[PDB]
């Protein structure tokens, strides 16, 4: 039953530099340990990324300012998260997301994942909900309520969960999830990377490459995506200051380095700085 409780006030926009985030593995092996220029779209380095609060944390508690704005998707999305509890466990893609154009839905289970395309009739509030199930049964949703109804589900798919939580997080290390969502040709591609972080709430300096998870053939156009989170009915939504960062990809981050094992340890962006363009031209880092 679609119950609406979200407020109607915007959040004061926040920004922060990416610090080189958004480089992922293209194609097959390259163990040369030598540069390999590529022409593919990534997230440009040192480009500031917004910072949305799913449950706006203001005052004594953030639960009084529920807010999950609908964000445009554009060419591609870099989605970064650090929420302790999996309040955000879903995703929605589409051009209008209103009972038309065969919108796309993705949902994550506690032990699985389901992707579907049923031309959903989305309810005005994209939530899921969770309930208690009477005898000898713990919290679990009786029914999804992301959308009013599903229509013919042209594409179906089920598999193991994308998000991993088996890692033992302590008071120092908190998991950070990064996802690159792209839609090229007839293929929707998701490149994910999970890694602990402890330095700060922001993204620490360093390097890391996102391996591909799946490559779903979906013949749909994506313009606006609204991060879907299974609002936990803590009658009465709640979240441990859940927040997510959204960046928009651009078609230039070219040079890619490799190490002995075959990992992308470092990379360069030719259009960032004149020095970087010089480094690209010589095909050398120094």
């Amino acid at each position, epitope marked *: 039953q679609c119950v609406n409780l979200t407020t109607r006030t915007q959040l004061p926009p926040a920004y922060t530099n990416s610090f080189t985030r958004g480089v992922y593995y293209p194609d097959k092996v390259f163990r040369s340990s030598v540069l390999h220029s590529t022409q593919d779209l990534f997230l440009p380095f040192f480009s500031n990324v917004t910072w949305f609060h799913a449950i706006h944390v203001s005052g004594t508690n953030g639960t009084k300012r529920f807010d999950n704005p609908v964000l445009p998707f554009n060419d591609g999305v870099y989605f970064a998260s650090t929420e302790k509890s999996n309040i955000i466990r879903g995703w929605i893609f589409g051009t209008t997301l209103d009972s038309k154009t065969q919108s796309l839905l993705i949902v994550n289970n506690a032990t699985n994942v389901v992707i579907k395309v049923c031309e959903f009739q989305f309810c005005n509030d994209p939530f899921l909900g969770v*309930y208690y199930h009477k*005898n000898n049964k713990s919290w679990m949703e009786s029914e999804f309520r992301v959308y009013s109804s599903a229509n013919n589900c042209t594409f179906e798919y089920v598999s193991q969960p994308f998000l991993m939580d088996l890692e033992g997080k302590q008071g120092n290390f908190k998991n950070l999830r990064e996802f690159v969502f792209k839609n090229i040709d007839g293929y929707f591609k998701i490149y994910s990377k999970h890694t602990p972080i402890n330095l700060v709430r922001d993204l620490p300096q360093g390097f890391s490459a996102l391996e591909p998870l799946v490559d779903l053939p979906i013949g749909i156009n994506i313009t606006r995506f609204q991060t879907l989170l299974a609002l*936990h009915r*803590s009658y009465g939504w*709640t979240a441990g200051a859940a927040a997510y960062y959204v960046g928009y990809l651009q078609p230039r981050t070219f040079l890619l380095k490799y190490n002995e094992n075959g990992t992308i340890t470092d990379a360069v962006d030719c259009a960032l700085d004149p020095l970087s363009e010089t480094k690209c031209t010589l095909k050398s880092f120094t």
Partner: antibody
Amino acid sequence: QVRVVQSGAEVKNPGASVKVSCKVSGYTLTELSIHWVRQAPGNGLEWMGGFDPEDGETIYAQKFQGRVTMTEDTSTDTAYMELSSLRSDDTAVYYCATAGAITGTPRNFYYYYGMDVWGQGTTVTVSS
Amino acid sequence: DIVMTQTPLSSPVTLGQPASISCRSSQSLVHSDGNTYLSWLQQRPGQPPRLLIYKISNRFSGVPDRFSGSGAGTDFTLKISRVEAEDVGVYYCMQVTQFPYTFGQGTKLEIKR
């Protein structure tokens, strides 16, 4: 906020089956467990039926045992108790309440409200 | 069986004075969780019993500042600062400690006349 709704009245005879309804709104019936509890006009409540959270089923009263069953549907969320051989102890407003368990995101601890929410209630009449 | 019985049957009282009811028990009401539990229901004339408290520590939603927990041992007490007219109906004292849920006969509240 929590509310409860119930039936209006019943007209029966001794030694015959009767059916009395109950429902928990505000907090869905799933959020708690209904205890079918009965009383006379201004009398103590008899624990005719208790939906034990531990057992997840209705247990009957010792005073009036061997006199009741139940029938419930989940799609329509309609819960009825099929009692029998009502009395003046039953000839009153049937108030049904539910015991709820409240916990944070984890299941650290479960409360037992016993009887959290109450409704208008159902009457009963027994005539020879 | 915890024998619950409210000693008084009627309570005519003049406005502006603390008043309460005793609720004796044959055996102790201590709960396995280690915290005691109490319950009080107020039934206004021709009205459903409104749960005054599901727990003495945490009273039910919509209880006047008058009603406050108190008592001596087995006897309980709903202390009142200044009595109000609406409380002129039946009263019930309940314990949610045990599964049988045995109740007393009940008490009626009236206006002095």
